[PDB]
Design a protein around this ligand. Structure first.
Ligand SMILES: Nc1nc2c(ncn2[C@@H]2O[C@H](COP(=O)(O)OP(=O)(O)OP(=O)(O)O)[C@@H](O)[C@H]2O)c(=O)[nH]1
Ligand SMILES: Nc1ncnc2c1ncn2[C@@H]1O[C@H](COP(=O)(O)OP(=O)(O)CP(=O)(O)O)[C@@H](O)[C@H]1O
Ligand SMILES: Nc1nc2c(ncn2[C@@H]2O[C@H](COP(=O)(O)OP(=O)(O)O)[C@@H](O)[C@H]2O)c(=O)[nH]1
Ligand SMILES: COc1ccc(CCc2cc(OC)c(OC)c(OC)c2)cc1O
Ligand SMILES: [Ca+2]
Ligand SMILES: [Mg+2]
Ligand SMILES: [Mg+2]
Lengths: 437, 334, 428, 62
């Protein structure tokens, strides 16, 4: 067994972390106080769930997580919330004044003052690990902490843990639930600085999740709580292979092997189905064929784009619930003849499939209905580059007038970093264009 | 109001379309780079499809289908017909074609060119026109542009008086629902000099474009014969109608082509919607068989029909999504 | 960043400042003695931003009251909520500035500024994390204008990494104390352009026209004008004072509102516009709020928004209403008038909703616009300034206090520059 | 068409289906960039305090 440490940075990462660890506790039968009656080996073990939980002599199962925010408002709600007993006080790290939506302020001004404290608290969990394999980092692209501090942390982890895999869960900025007009700036800057330091990154466009909540959950104006519970389902699907018995995606290195053949193109598209409202009084359960086919409708993707106009480099199907291989292959054969699924010539046309028999768990009183079977598809398609184009155009529009650039220079950043980061994004878009057309 | 942008200035079709929209009093034009639009009349090439459908509070429509180029490029149109089971190789309405690159299907093309020589039958091809293969291969590598080698229709239908050749142009509007609307008015783009069975360099009687001609204008105004006259000629000359002898095949070809690509380009469940106007170019041999020559993704209309067609585009494609306050189209059902 | 230090200087500053503390104290449920007799905990969640907590469950405004003339300050202590202020925070001189900017900035005010800075330092030391300062003041007199900018320069010296926000009342011949007001305003604007991060331009020309043209007040008083100011001031601080999704602070506002450091002069707006006493019975609908707040008739700066372009906009809706309908109504306005918003700043209109409505209204909306049409205000001041300065009229009042004509020419040119900088982005 | 490497267990099973075959900076460099930015901040704030110093001189002169 090899442990994984989760790092949650800024508001978006912290609040998504709460939703994920809440979901993990329900999934593994861990109570809010940390007790796990089904664990018969008290105070230790090397089970699959020990990848995410360490154990105390008193039987407490404690997340291998560190929460970091440059301001204390959000993490304080963890410190006082329903799951306060779960974490150890040293894993919740707060400053007093945040990054003010400024990448440079999070990276240079305030980050430099707190980076060493965080790395020491991270080192505290790593010393508790017999086989630490790497980290899962949750953050927003848009926030000053989510963008600026994360990139600083990511560069350091490469120095202190050069041998460990680093996975990202990244919240892509959307105007519908956005926080700042400068979010395109922070996105390009953080992507450029983090790119060499991430092995695999799952982007979640707040636009996609917002519309899924409106369209399928029947929620007029989704809250962060609505969005986060849905995101946590997708994260739990993606991480289930690390926490449960199984043959597919059992270590972080396997995410790179299975999903990322090129290092820079390491942003797999996630598609999840079915999303069903709890309020819906009558529901017809969807079959393996229906939910698998749903994996190729853009309206179900974490990022809105058109895979039909790109090429695939890898594709994993992660089912949970009542699914057998026979039904999966029958669905795949049907879908293959009817949809536009082009792989690149130097990769095989094939799906890696994993099935967990336990159906997805839903938070009591949440908005997601219990379903008999669900699937999360992770495909590495060039079509996700559409999100880079969308983001880079907004960056170009403001930067042509140097709008807001003074707020970054004022924090010690040179204007040249804007164009370096943008040129890297220009290179990234060109990389996707080669592989894709 | 509704809003729209104009990003293709050289488009005569949508220059009229935008003009008509303004005249309603319910459509406001914006600048190229203003993103808060309801409708985009986008650029012919590198149109930014990845930026559409991400404006909250805006239903966005564009006048092009992403992926439609695979039907509107000669090299890709051949590839699509050979490789799509829905079309087959035994496709009976497309001339034998082979992709040839300037440096691929050159060994495949010459092996069938021997069957045309060992059988000693008609062996003329088009790329310019020649009866010997290696004559224009010297001209294909001469340009450094991927060319298509196509068997030329040696026995075309010829109109009298004149013993002339022609090509039929059909305008097809596909809306956001992927309904296929054939404009009821077509155009014959006629040759004015008589067709010579052995004057391949004489391009005026072999290539029937409106530019090459402009005896130009002798038999009909602008080398354009519309369906009223051509139908009458077929009645008098051949004892048949335009519908029976030609138009059934044309609607079959249009339906077949657009059904083949529908799964690849349909915007049924997309975050943005598409429509597009197509121009299909057809040939008619002497036994009244219709052949598909090319599909135009950015077609220009005929001068007499601009007003009616452009009003139809606004009718069925644009107002169908953005309402306000007989049909000229034949719905090709499926 | 949680604590804000409030400073009100001179007559105008102290009167609108006192009215502000009356209004938000009522909203947070604090009585004149300093005791909380409210009912919702939302009133207390961010009460620390403006109030220090005192012995015996008493909340004390973090406010410093400054005047060179003892008069208005006595009016405050005897005013309705005057008891709540910390007595040591009253810092007053004896002679007054006489509507002379030079006396406030260079001679009379310089003598008192240090005593104000000591009170500022004492309030800052009690701060867990001071986020910045807000000043209320007029630009047409001498104390709030001349001494007010002197304090701002001094505070930036001692707190260079803190945000400076001002509520600056603009002089108007329609409400005019003296002929030298364009001189005082032009000298103050020169300071505000360099030493504040956010300035709300409260124009007495607009406050009068609203009272006369819209509210049907034939001869409006300062009391009628300040009713509009306190409602706007309550609105623009809603997000600082209440628990929200945003969790807003002065720095995030400056970052997102100000694309270029000098262009930080905001045009505020309010809807619905109401006169004192006369109550409202018909609540506005979300479409009505949106249309009114963007209407020039509701702008607190006498500028036509259709003569410029919005660089950024911040709008705060208060009351129980459909947040979906607000989103559809804001999207409606930007989409039907996209020509008046710059296309090179994506998503430049931000909207927040607060459950708690202000007193007397069930639905209300406050508008903060960074528009290039604000140059109309500066051009108005510049024309009045030049009309006198070309004849060096009334200048002896200032050369007698040590000022040189050169200092007037420089202030003139900087405000003209600010004017031309706004025009640069209006056409871009 | 071809199903391979099928593994089973009590929790579930995994496999692979093939439809067609195919055809870092150091610690020193980080600490130097973080402190080059701080120097740029010190210089900008020193320039501010120098400008504010000139203003105080002018206030004395008037
Ligand atoms: N899905 C989701 N997105 C969030 C959530 N909270 C914030 N965001 C997104 O994060 C972006 C802003 O970054 P934040 O994480 O809020 O800011 P930060 O990381 O705390 O850094 P600071 O600016 O210093 O506060 C916005 O685009 C939001 O859409 C959340 O709870 N769920
Ligand atoms: N295989 C073939 N047999 C007979 N005639 C042919 C032919 N291929 C092309 N032609 C003739 O050549 C002319 C031009 O062919 P083509 O359609 O490729 O040119 P083009 O694409 O410039 C016309 P458009 O203006 O619609 O784009 C047609 O009018 C047609 O009559
Ligand atoms: N809106 C408003 N404006 C005021 C008020 N008092 C003064 N003013 C304006 O401020 C200018 C006079 O400045 P004043 O505050 O009296 O000078 P100070 O006391 O030395 O700061 C004039 O242009 C007035 O129009 C007030 O109570 N409300
Ligand atoms: C496009 O412009 C933006 C502007 C402001 C913000 C955030 C800060 C912020 C918003 C407020 O909402 C109106 C507000 O209320 C007045 C506030 O006050 C402190 C602060 C984001 C933006 O993207
Ligand atoms: Ca155990
Ligand atoms: Mg934050
Ligand atoms: Mg006065």
């Amino acid at each position: 067994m090899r442990e994984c440490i989760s790092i949650h940075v800024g508001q978006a990462g912290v609040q998504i972390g709460n939703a994920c660890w809440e979901l993990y506790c329900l999934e593994h039968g861990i109570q809010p106080d940390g007790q796990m009656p089904s664990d018969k080996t008290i105070g230790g073990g090397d089970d699959s769930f020990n990848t995410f939980f360490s154990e105390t002599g008193a039987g407490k199962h404690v997340p291998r997580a560190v929460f970091v925010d440059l301001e204390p408002t959000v993490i304080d709600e963890v410190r006082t919330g329903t799951y306060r007993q779960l974490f150890h006080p040293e894993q919740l790290i707060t400053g007093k004044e945040d990054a003010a939506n400024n990448y440079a302020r999070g990276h240079y001004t305030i980050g430099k003052e707190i980076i060493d404290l965080v790395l020491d608290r991270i080192r505290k969990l790593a010393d508790q690990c017999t086989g630490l394999q790497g980290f899962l980092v949750f953050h927003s692209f848009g926030g000053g902490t989510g963008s600026g501090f994360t990139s600083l942390l990511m560069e350091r982890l490469s120095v202190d843990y050069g041998k460990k895999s680093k996975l990202e869960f990244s919240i892509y900025p959307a105007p519908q639930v956005s926080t700042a007009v400068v979010e395109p700036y922070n996105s390009i800057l953080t992507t450029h600085t983090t790119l060499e330091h991430s092995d695999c990154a799952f982007m979640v466009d707040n636009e996609a999740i917002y519309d899924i909540c409106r369209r399928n959950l029947d929620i007029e104006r989704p809250t962060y709580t609505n969005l986060n519970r849905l995101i946590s389902q997708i994260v739990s699907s993606i991480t289930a292979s690390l926490r449960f018995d199984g043959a597919l995606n059992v270590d972080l290195t396997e995410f790179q092997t299975n999903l990322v053949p090129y290092p820079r193109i390491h942003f797999p598209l996630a598609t999840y189905a079915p999303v069903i409202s709890a309020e819906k009084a009558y529901h017809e359960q969807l079959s393996v064929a229906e939910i698998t086919n749903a994996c190729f409708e853009p309206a179900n993707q974490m990022v809105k784009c058109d895979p039909r106009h790109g090429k695939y480099m890898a594709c994993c199907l992660l089912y949970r619930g009542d699914v057998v291989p026979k039904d999966v292959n029958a669905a795949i054969a049907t879908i293959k003849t009817k949809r536009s699924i082009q792989f690149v010539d130097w990769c095989p046309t094939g799906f890696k499939v994993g099935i967990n028999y336990q159906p997805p768990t839903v938070v009591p009183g949440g908005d997601l209905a219990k379903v008999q079977r669900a699937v999360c598809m992770l495909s590495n398609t060039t079509a996700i580059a559409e999100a880079w184009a969308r983001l880079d155009h907004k960056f170009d529009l403001m930067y042509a007038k140097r709008a807001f650039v003074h707020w970054y220079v004022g924090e010690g950043m040179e204007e040249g970093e804007f164009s370096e980061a943008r040129e890297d994004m220009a290179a990234l878009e060109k990389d996707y264009e080669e592989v894709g057309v | 109001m509704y809003t729209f942008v104009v990003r293709d200035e050289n488009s005569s079709v949508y220059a009229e379309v935008s003009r008509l929209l303004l005249a309603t009093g319910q459509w406001k034009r914006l600048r190229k780079d203003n993103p808060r639009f309801n409708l985009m009349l986008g650029e012919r090439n590198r149109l930014p499809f990845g930026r559409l459908g991400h404006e909250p509070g805006l239903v966005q429509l564009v006048n092009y289908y992403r992926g439609a180029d695979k039907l509107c490029r000669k090299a890709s149109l051949v590839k699509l017909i050979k490789t799509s089971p829905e079309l087959s190789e035994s496709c009976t309405w497309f001339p034998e074609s082979y992709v040839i690159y300037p440096t691929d299907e050159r060994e495949v093309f010459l092996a069938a060119y021997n069957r045309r020589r060992e059988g000693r039958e008609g062996n003329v091809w088009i790329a310019l026109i020649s009866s010997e293969a290696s004559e224009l291969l010297d001209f294909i590598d001469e340009q450094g542009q991927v060319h298509v080698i196509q068997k030329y229709l040696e026995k075309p239908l010829l109109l009298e008086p004149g013993h002339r050749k022609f090509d039929i142009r059909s305008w097809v509007l596909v809306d956001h629902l992927y309904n296929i609307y054939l404009y009821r008015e077509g155009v014959l783009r006629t040759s004015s000099e008589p067709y010579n069975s052995a004057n391949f360099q004489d391009k005026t009687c072999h290539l029937t474009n409106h530019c090459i001609q402009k005896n130009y204008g002798r038999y009909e105004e602008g080398n354009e014969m519309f369906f009223e006259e051509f139908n009458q000629y077929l009645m008098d000359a051949l004892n048949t109608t335009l519908e029976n002898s030609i138009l059934l095949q044309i609607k079959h070809i249009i339906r077949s082509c657009l059904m083949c690509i529908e799964p690849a380009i349909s915007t049924k469940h997309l975050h943005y919607q598409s429509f597009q106007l197509f121009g299909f170019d057809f040939m008619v041999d002497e036994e009244l068989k219709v052949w598909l020559i090319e599909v135009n993704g950015a077609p220009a209309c005929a001068q007499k029909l601009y007003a009616e067609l452009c009003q139809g585009i606004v009718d069925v494609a644009i107002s169908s999504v953005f309402p306000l306050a007989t049909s000229i189209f034949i719905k090709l059902h499926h | 960043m949680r604590e804000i230090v409030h400073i009100q200087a001179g007559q105008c500053g102290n009167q609108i400042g006192a009215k502000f503390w009356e209004v938000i104290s009522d909203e947070h449920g604090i009585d004149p003695t300093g005791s909380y007799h409210g009912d919702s905990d939302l009133q207390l969640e961010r009460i620390n931003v403006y109030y220090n907590e005192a012995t015996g469950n008493k909340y004390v405004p973090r406010a410093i009251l400054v005047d060179l003339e003892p008069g208005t300050m006595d009016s405050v202590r005897s005013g309705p909520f005057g008891q709540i202020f910390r007595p040591d925070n009253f810092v007053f001189g004896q002679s007054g500035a006489g509507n002379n900017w030079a006396k406030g900035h260079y001679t009379e005010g310089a003598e008192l500024v240090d005593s104000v800075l000591d009170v500022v330092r004492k309030e800052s030391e009690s701060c867990d994390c001071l986020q910045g300062f807000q000043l209320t003041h007029s630009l047409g007199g001498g104390t709030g204008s001349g001494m007010g900018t002197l304090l701002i320069s001094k505070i930036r010296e001692e707190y260079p990494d803190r945000i400076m926000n001002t509520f600056s009342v603009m002089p108007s011949p329609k409400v005019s104390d003296t002929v030298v007001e364009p001189y005082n305003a032009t000298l103050s604007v020169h300071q505000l352009v360099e030493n504040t991060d956010e300035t709300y331009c409260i124009d007495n020309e607009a406050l009068y026209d609203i009272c006369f043209r819209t509210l049907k007040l034939t001869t409006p008083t300062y009391g009628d004008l300040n009713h509009l100011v306190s409602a706007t001031m309550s609105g623009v601080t809603t997000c600082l004072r209440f628990p929200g999704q945003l969790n807003a602070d002065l720095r995030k506002l400056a970052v997102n509102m100000v694309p270029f450091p000098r262009l930080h002069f905001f045009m505020p707006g309010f809807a619905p516009l109401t006169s004192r006493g006369s109550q409202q019975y018909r609540a506005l609908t979300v479409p009505e709020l949106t249309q009114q707040m963007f209407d020039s008739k509701n702008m607190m700066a006498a500028c036509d928004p259709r003569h410029g372009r919005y660089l950024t906009v911040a709008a705060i809706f208060r009351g129980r209403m459909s947040m979906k309908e607000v989103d559809e109504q804001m999207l409606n306005v930007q989409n039907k008038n996209s020509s008046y918003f710059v296309e090179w700043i994506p998503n430049n209109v931000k909207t927040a909703v607060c459950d708690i409505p202000p007193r007397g209204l069930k639905m209300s909306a406050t508008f903060i616009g960074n528009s290039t049409a604000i140059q109309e205000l500066f051009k108005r001041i510049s024309e009045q300034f030049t009309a006198m300065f070309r004849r060096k009229a009334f200048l002896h009042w200032y050369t007698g206090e040590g000022m040189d004509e050169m200092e007037f020419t420089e202030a003139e040119s900087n405000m003209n520059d600010l004017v031309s900088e706004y025009q640069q982005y209006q056409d871009a | 068409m071809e199903v391979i490497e099928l593994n089973k267990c009590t929790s579930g099973q995994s496999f692979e289906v093939i439809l067609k075959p195919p055809s870092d900076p150091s610690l020193e460099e980080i600490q130097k960039k973080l402190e080059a930015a701080e120097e740029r901040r010190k210089y900008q704030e020193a320039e501010l305090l120098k400008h504010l110093a000139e203003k105080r001189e002018h206030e004395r002169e008037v």
